[PDB]
């Protein structure tokens, strides 16, 4: 049962204008199975485009590979991010590389160490603000994690579900 391309796909920023199909497999075989790959090329003088992409045969090879970073492929650090798998309608395709996310539905009982304990399992945590009412200081029922790189935000928000203190959370990218 495979898991759908669009979650095992790596955009390639910043590639180095010599940088081929070849090559690029080459480096990024390195963490997994390569169902594709490919360097995006003007179509008239086949210049290289500066970026491309590769997929993987999984999700976990994916994982492998942004855990990987920083990779210098053919002398140059590249820029890898996870597919666009949900758009915002207004930008369509555009990556919203952010580092936060928004958590809701964590009502009055969802401590510090509950956000901490599930979500440092997608990334190193910086920032942890559980939000309460300006004037009573109780407890709002959302928060706001904050990481120290995107691609941990990126895991997060391709889940259908996240689950923290018993809670079903409502997760989202944030500002
Ligand atoms: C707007 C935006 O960044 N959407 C995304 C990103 C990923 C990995 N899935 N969906």
């Known amino acids: 049962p495979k898991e ?70 053919d002398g140059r650090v590249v820029e890898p991010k996870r597919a666009v798998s949900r758009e915002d309608s207004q930008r369509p395709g555009a990556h919203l590389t952010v580092k936060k996310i928004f958590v809701g539905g964590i009502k009055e009982d969802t401590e510090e160490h509950h956000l901490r304990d599930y979500f440092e399992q997608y990334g190193k945590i910086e920032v942890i603000e559980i939000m309460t009412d300006r004037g009573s200081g109780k407890k709002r029922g959302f928060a706001f994690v904050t990481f120290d790189d995107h691609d941990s935000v990126d895991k997060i928000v391709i889940q259908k579900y996240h689950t923290v203190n018993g809670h079903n959370c409502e997760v989202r990218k944030a500002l």
Not at 5 to 31: A, N, V
Not at 35 to 62: H, I, L, Q, W
Request: charged share 25%; net charge negative; glycine share 8%.
């Open 4 to 73: 759908p391309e669009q979650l095992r796909k790596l955009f390639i920023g910043g590639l180095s204008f010599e940088t081929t199909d070849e090559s690029l497999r080459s480096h990024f075989e390195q963490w997994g199975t390569l169902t594709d790959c490919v360097v995006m090329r003007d179509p008239n003088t086949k210049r290289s485009r500066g970026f491309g992409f590769v997929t993987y045969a999984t999700v976990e090879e994916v994982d492998a590979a942004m855990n990987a970073r920083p990779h210098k492929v």
